[PDB]
Amino acid sequence: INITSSASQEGTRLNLICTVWHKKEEAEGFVVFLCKDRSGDCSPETSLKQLRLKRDISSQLMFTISQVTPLHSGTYQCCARSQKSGIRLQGHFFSILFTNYTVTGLKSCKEDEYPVGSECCPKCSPGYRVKEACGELTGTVCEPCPPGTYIAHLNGLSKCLQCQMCDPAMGLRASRNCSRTENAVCGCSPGHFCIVQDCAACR
Numbered sequence: 633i634n635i636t637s638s639a640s641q642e643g644t645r646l647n648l649i650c651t652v653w654h655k656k657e658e659a660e661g662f663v664v665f666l667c668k669d670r671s672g673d674c675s676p677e678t679s680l681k682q683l684r685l686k687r688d689i690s691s692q693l694m695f696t697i698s699q700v701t702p703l704h705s706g707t708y709q710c711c712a713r714s715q716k717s718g719i720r721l722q723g724h725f726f727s728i729l730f731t732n733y734t735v736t737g738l739k740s741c742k743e744d745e746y747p748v749g750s751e752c753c754p755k756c757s758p759g760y761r762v763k764e765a766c767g768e769l770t771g772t773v774c775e776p777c778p779p780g781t782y783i784a785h786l787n788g789l790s791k792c793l794q795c796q797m798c799d800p801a802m803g804l805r806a807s808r809n810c811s812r813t814e815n816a817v818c819g820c821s822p823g824h825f826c827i828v829q830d831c832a833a834c835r
């Protein structure tokens with residue numbers, strides 16, 4: 633499994649290409665999607681284009697721009713995700729720079745990149761740890777956070793953070809549940825009021 637981004641100019645047309653290799657019996661459920669100028673919340677719902685497949689080994693999304701304009705100026709990302717597996721792929725960022733234009737980042741770090749040896753890798757989405765770091769040509773692999781853990785922010789973390797448990801013994805209970813992207817909150821039990829803050833315990 634991997635993901636790569638590239639581009640082809642043919643005529644005045646410019647083609648942006650997201651290419652993903654995935655195991656064949658992963659194909660059913662699979663989405664690949666290109667977003668422009670996200671804040672690390674590439675989702676299908678927010679993508680310029682998307683492609684969804686069902687089979688029952690490579691998949692490629694192309695996004696064609698007939699003529700390049702300052703409207704096309706920006707940073708793009710190719711992303712993909714498996715619906716059965718939950719696994720998500722984060723392509724390398726690349727930006728169209730209109731000036732006549734140039735495309736960059738095809739092939740220190742950016743906001744939404746983290747550092748890894750001699751490269752800068754795409755961060756994983758909220759609610760996802762880094763399964764596998766990016767290589768030169770290939771982007772980052774992300775796995776969803778397992779139940780009991782979370783990460784709220786775009787990240788390059790290899791373990792998810794442990795959601796805080798609340799001690800029933802202290803008149804604490806979860807006022808907000810633990811989801812993959814949100815930590816739990818401890819509030820007070822029925823008819824209890826808080827006395828130590830952080831609540832650490834209730835009366």
Ligand SMILES: *[C@@H]1O[C@H](CO)[C@@H](O[C@@H]2O[C@H](CO)[C@@H](O[C@@H]3O[C@H](CO)[C@@H](O)[C@H](O[C@@H]4O[C@H](CO)[C@@H](O)[C@H](O)[C@@H]4O)[C@@H]3O)[C@H](O)[C@H]2NC(C)=O)[C@H](O)[C@H]1NC(C)=O
Nearest residue numbers: 633634635636651652653654655689690767768769770771
């Ligand atoms: C993204 O992922 C793609 C699918 O995984 C990948 O395409 C595969 O690439 C691998 C590695 O290049 C290919 O494996 C080679 O296959 C031939 C047999 O057909 C082998 O000759 C070759 O072995 C090489 O030489 C030695 C003896 O074989 C071996 O010991 C070495 O390890 C060496 O690699 C490889 O085993 C495979 O055919 C591809 N699979 C398919 C389905 O096409 C893309 O390269 C990858 N893209 C990027 C940018 O990483």
Ligand SMILES: *[C@@H]1O[C@H](CO)[C@@H](O[C@@H]2O[C@H](CO)[C@@H](O)[C@H](O)[C@H]2NC(C)=O)[C@H](O)[C@H]1NC(C)=O
Nearest residue numbers: 805806807808809810811816817818819821822
């Ligand atoms: C975390 O999940 C559980 C199970 O869905 C929620 O359980 C609720 O708890 C309240 C208060 O104890 C009870 O009245 C009900 O039995 C449950 N209500 C509902 C609507 O499911 C628990 O409260 C969840 N936490 C939050 C903040 O949603």
